[PDB]
Structures are given as structure tokens and as C-alpha cells.
């Protein structure tokens, strides 16, 4: 599967972003596309994820309403909003997929990322 | 919340081998468990390197190798070569009550000489 | 048909799940290690099939005492002394949820409970989050998994 994000964004504290990602080839049934984001200089961390064959969606407690991953089947394009930048948000967040046998052996937020995005920085102030 | 407790930095010459250790890893009340390893290179994105424990997809050598007990999850790369100089992160499936997956505080390999 | 004066979708909503096992037999009663290293083999051995209730983890068959047994976690007993039940392999399978409908709420910020596509009011109180799968999702008091907006631990 390949995966690219959108560009760059630069924003303000109390404004919002939203950041796309798109599937070129997907051979896989059970699947899911999560965001995870890299503060500078520091580790990963998982935000949320959704399920896009059912539309659900997993969040951390952090980020807790301030945060909607909406992904859609048809142009193989998923979404994270956050709202309400603080400065900490600064980072760069990637997408990456998860795909999963349609046996079910695996779960479905288990953290097989083999497809991952290029990344989009955000910055605030 | 919290993180896999992993080394800040283990270091090897060409051709050695390294073991970059993890203790914290989550495990479901009946057993279910899930331990991934990731590769990033500056300014780049992760990339897969054992997806379950022990597991390794196509295109990564022989040389990274997983291993499971407990908590603890281990990542042995051997023959160390240049281009493994980056940063790598363990990543556990978070377990009943935390939803998703939870990182490892990310391992800083040198290769020297 | 409804309860609580609630009047006004798509949902991901999840036990005929088997788990394939044997028995153990010998007139001698118990040996769980070596049943295991004689189903290793690839005392005598039979197919005896089980499905599991994905929420207890319980599997369910004829053979046991109540038709029930959980999986120590390493052997389960049956109606008799010298039977002994093992799995082939020592869970849910993750691919036996699907996408329902039925539009549910009563207030702009609140929400009683939704309508299966059959028509019946599955109410929304007392319930709990629960895991499932790895996704996480309410377990209701009636006792089906749903996964909705969601604040109670199972």
C-alpha cells in the first residue's frame, strides 16, 4: 500500500487543522488506519485510529474531544482533526495503515503499522 | 499515560551484534499480546521491522530478529551494518483498559568507526 | 416497546464461534501434561469441538458438567473423572463483527439506547466500556458488545 499525506500547516493556539492521507492499493479486507505523532526531538505516540469498513473510530484518553479521525472508503482517504491547538501539538504526524488477515487471528489496534505515511508538520505560534 | 521502558542508547562496530531490551509490554487477561519493533531514520518515518513478536515482513534481512517473555520484548539486530543507525521503538498493544497501542521511550543506535 | 420517555444511524455491532479440542481418556483419571505432548504426537485422544462466548472467554459443549469450563487454564473437566477436556490450541476471532443501523436519540446531548433492524429498544443505561477485538466499545446490561460514542469499566 502506498500512502501520502497532505502538506505542511502552520496555525495558531486555539485554531484547527486537519490532515489527509491517501490509499493507493489495498488487497486487504480487515484493515485500519491510524495517526500517530513525533513531538521534536521526542518518541511516538499513538493519538487514535478507525475501523473504515464500520466507521469506528478509537481515541486516546489524551486528546480526549478535541480530536475526530473520519476516513472515507470511496477516494481511499482518511482524516485527523485536532482542535483547539496548543503550542505542545507542535509535532509531525503520521499515518499508518494496519493490514490485517481476514482470518482474525490479529486484533484490530494491535500496532502492525507496515504503511506509513511521509508525515505532515504542524506548527503553533 | 506511561510508555515501554526501553535503553536510551546501545552502540556496536560493523559486523557485532546489539540487543535493545523492553520491559512494560501489555498482555490481555486471557493472553492476547502483540509487540512491534520500528526503524526511523532522521526525518523520516518509522518503518516495520518485527510485527509480531519474533515476526519479521518481507524485505527486512535476517540480521533484526524479535523475541518475547513476559513483558519483556528484545530486539537483536547481528551483523550491524551503517545503515542501521537510527532510532527504534517497541510498540505493545495497550492491554484491556487503555484503548490502542503504547510506545516505547525510543532506543538511539551508533554504529562506530 | 421503549422505556424512559425517549422518542426521536450506523453501528458496528459483534457465539457460534467453535474452538476445535479432544478428549482424554484412560481406567486411570488425569494427566494434563502429557495429554498435550500426546496431542503433540500430531491414554487415548478424540475430536470434541467447543465454541467460546466471546464476552466469558467460556467455551460450551455437551461434554462438560454444565456446558460450560474455562481456560491453571490448562486442562477442564467433563461430566466424567477419567475425561479430561484440551484445547488444539491454548480466543475471538476477529472477524465476526458487522455494520447495523438503527437510529436511537431522544435529546440533542442525549442518548437512551438504539433499535436493532429487527425493531427492538436495547436501552443505553447501566452499560460499560469494554475491549473486544482490540476496539473499544460498550458492553451493554442486556449483554451485547456495541461500539457508540460513549463511561463504566466492565
Redesign the interface.
Given at each position: 500500500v502506498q500512502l501520502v499525506q497532505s502538506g505542511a500547516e502552520v496555525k495558531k493556539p486555539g485554531s484547527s487543522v486537519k490532515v489527509s492521507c491517501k490509499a493507493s492499493g489495498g488487497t486487504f479486507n480487515?484493515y485500519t488506519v491510524?495517526w500517530?505523532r513525533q513531538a521534536p526531538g521526542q518518541?511516538?505516540?499513538?493519538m487514535?485510529?478507525i475501523?473504515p469498513?464500520?466507521?469506528?473510530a478509537?481515541?486516546?484518553?489524551?486528546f480526549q474531544g478535541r480530536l475526530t479521525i473520519t476516513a472515507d472508503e470511496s477516494t481511499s482517504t482518511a482524516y485527523m482533526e485536532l482542535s483547539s491547538l496548543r503550542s505542545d501539538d507542535t509535532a509531525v504526524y503520521?499515518c499508518?495503515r494496519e493490514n490485517?488477515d481476514?482470518?482474525?487471528?490479529?486484533?484490530?489496534?494491535?500496532?502492525?503499522?507496515?504503511p506509513?505515511?511521509?508525515?505532515t508538520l504542524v506548527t503553533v505560534s | 499515560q506511561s510508555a515501554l521502558t526501553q535503553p536510551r542508547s546501545v552502540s556496536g562496530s560493523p559486523g557485532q551484534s546489539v540487543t535493545i531490551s523492553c520491559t512494560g509490554t501489555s498482555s490481555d487477561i486471557g493472553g492476547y499480546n502483540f509487540v512491534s519493533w520500528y526503524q526511523q531514520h532522521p526525518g523520516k518515518a518509522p518503518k516495520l521491522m518485527i510485527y509480531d513478536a519474533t515476526k519479521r515482513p518481507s524485505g527486512v534481512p535476517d540480521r533484526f530478529s524479535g523475541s518475547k517473555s513476559g513483558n519483556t520484548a528484545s530486539l537483536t539486530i547481528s551483523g550491524l551494518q551503517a545503515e542501521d543507525e537510527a532510532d527504534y521503538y517497541c510498540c505493545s498493544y495497550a492491554g484491556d483498559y487503555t484503548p490502542g497501542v503504547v510506545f516505547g521511550g525510543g532506543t538511539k543506535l551508533t554504529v562506530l568507526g | 416497546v421503549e422505556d424512559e420517555g425517549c422518542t426521536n444511524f450506523s453501528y458496528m455491532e459483534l457465539s457460534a464461534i467453535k474452538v476445535n479440542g479432544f478428549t482424554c481418556t484412560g481406567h486411570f483419571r488425569p494427566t494434563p501434561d502429557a495429554c498435550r505432548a500426546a496431542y503433540n504426537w500430531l491414554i487415548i485422544i478424540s475430536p470434541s469441538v467447543t465454541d467460546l462466548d466471546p464476552y466469558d472467554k467460556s467455551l460450551h459443549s455437551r461434554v462438560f458438567p454444565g456446558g460450560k469450563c474455562s481456560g491453571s487454564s490448562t486442562y477442564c473437566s467433563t461430566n466424567h473423572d477419567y475425561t479430561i477436556w484440551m484445547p488444539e490450541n491454548p480466543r475471538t476471532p476477529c472477524d465476526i463483527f458487522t455494520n447495523s443501523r438503527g437510529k436511537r436519540a431522544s435529546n440533542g446531548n442525549k442518548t437512551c439506547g438504539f433499535v436493532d433492524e429487527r425493531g427492538l429498544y436495547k436501552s443505553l443505561k447501566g452499560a460499560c466500556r469494554l475491549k473486544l477485538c482490540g476496539v473499544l466499545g460498550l458492553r451493554l446490561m442486556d449483554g451485547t458488545w456495541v461500539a457508540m460514542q460513549t463511561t463504566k469499566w466492565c
Amino acid at each position: 500500500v502506498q500512502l501520502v499525506q497532505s502538506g505542511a500547516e502552520v496555525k495558531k493556539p486555539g485554531s484547527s487543522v486537519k490532515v489527509s492521507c491517501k490509499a493507493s492499493g489495498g488487497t486487504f479486507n480487515r484493515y485500519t488506519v491510524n495517526w500517530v505523532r513525533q513531538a521534536p526531538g521526542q518518541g511516538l505516540e499513538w493519538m487514535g485510529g478507525i475501523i473504515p469498513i464500520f466507521g469506528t473510530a478509537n481515541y486516546a484518553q489524551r486528546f480526549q474531544g478535541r480530536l475526530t479521525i473520519t476516513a472515507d472508503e470511496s477516494t481511499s482517504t482518511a482524516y485527523m482533526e485536532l482542535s483547539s491547538l496548543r503550542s505542545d501539538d507542535t509535532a509531525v504526524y503520521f499515518c499508518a495503515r494496519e493490514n490485517l488477515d481476514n482470518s482474525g487471528t490479529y486484533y484490530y489496534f494491535s500496532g502492525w503499522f507496515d504503511p506509513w505515511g511521509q508525515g505532515t508538520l504542524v506548527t503553533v505560534s | 499515560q506511561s510508555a515501554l521502558t526501553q535503553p536510551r542508547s546501545v552502540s556496536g562496530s560493523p559486523g557485532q551484534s546489539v540487543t535493545i531490551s523492553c520491559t512494560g509490554t501489555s498482555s490481555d487477561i486471557g493472553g492476547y499480546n502483540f509487540v512491534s519493533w520500528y526503524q526511523q531514520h532522521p526525518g523520516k518515518a518509522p518503518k516495520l521491522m518485527i510485527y509480531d513478536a519474533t515476526k519479521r515482513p518481507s524485505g527486512v534481512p535476517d540480521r533484526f530478529s524479535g523475541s518475547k517473555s513476559g513483558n519483556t520484548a528484545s530486539l537483536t539486530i547481528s551483523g550491524l551494518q551503517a545503515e542501521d543507525e537510527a532510532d527504534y521503538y517497541c510498540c505493545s498493544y495497550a492491554g484491556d483498559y487503555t484503548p490502542g497501542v503504547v510506545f516505547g521511550g525510543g532506543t538511539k543506535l551508533t554504529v562506530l568507526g | 416497546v421503549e422505556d424512559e420517555g425517549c422518542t426521536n444511524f450506523s453501528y458496528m455491532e459483534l457465539s457460534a464461534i467453535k474452538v476445535n479440542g479432544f478428549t482424554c481418556t484412560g481406567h486411570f483419571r488425569p494427566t494434563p501434561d502429557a495429554c498435550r505432548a500426546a496431542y503433540n504426537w500430531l491414554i487415548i485422544i478424540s475430536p470434541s469441538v467447543t465454541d467460546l462466548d466471546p464476552y466469558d472467554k467460556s467455551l460450551h459443549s455437551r461434554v462438560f458438567p454444565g456446558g460450560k469450563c474455562s481456560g491453571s487454564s490448562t486442562y477442564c473437566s467433563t461430566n466424567h473423572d477419567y475425561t479430561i477436556w484440551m484445547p488444539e490450541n491454548p480466543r475471538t476471532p476477529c472477524d465476526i463483527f458487522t455494520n447495523s443501523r438503527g437510529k436511537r436519540a431522544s435529546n440533542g446531548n442525549k442518548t437512551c439506547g438504539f433499535v436493532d433492524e429487527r425493531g427492538l429498544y436495547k436501552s443505553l443505561k447501566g452499560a460499560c466500556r469494554l475491549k473486544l477485538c482490540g476496539v473499544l466499545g460498550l458492553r451493554l446490561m442486556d449483554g451485547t458488545w456495541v461500539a457508540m460514542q460513549t463511561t463504566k469499566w466492565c
